[PDB]
Amino acid sequence: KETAAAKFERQHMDSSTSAASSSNYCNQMMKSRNLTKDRCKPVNTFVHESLADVQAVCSQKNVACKNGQTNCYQSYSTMSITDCRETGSSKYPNCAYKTTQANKHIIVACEGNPYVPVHFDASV
């Protein structure tokens, strides 16, 4: 199986680059991080910061989650992030995505010990 924190890192962590390289970044990343293994993950955001910085958000601003949960936190500063969304002409197994780079405040849900991100709620 896969832990909740490991899935987060796998799906949303990309310290490798500082920004979404080109407009094909998403098509590559969604494939490499196995987000299109047996299905095309329709939407997914990647964070371009260290793991440390992303985990630190679990001890920053405590905001409400979109689903109502009270374990979401918002990063005090904006972060470099890439939003990946399936294009209208996309379909498993040939998944297609639109890359959208931006610096926004990430909002993640945290849990466990250590208290780390286990779900990407959104970016503002």
> Shortest gap between Cβ of 116 and Cl ion (angstroms)?
16
Quote the CA–CA distance of 83 and 99 in Å, as a whole number. 6
Asked if residue 42 lies in contact with residue 86, where contact means CB atoms within 8 angstroms, the answer is: yes
Inter-CA distances, 1 with 31, 36, 56, 88, Å: 19, 17, 26, 32
Taking the least distance from each CB to Cl ion, the nearer of 53 and 113 is 53
Q: Which of 17, 18, 69, 78 binds Cl ion (CB under 5 A)?
A: 78
45 is a contact residue toward Cl ion (CB under 5 A) = yes
Please give the residue ranges that form the binding site for Cl ion (CB under 5 A).
44-45, 77-78, 120
Residues annotated as catalytic (active site), given as ranges: 12, 119
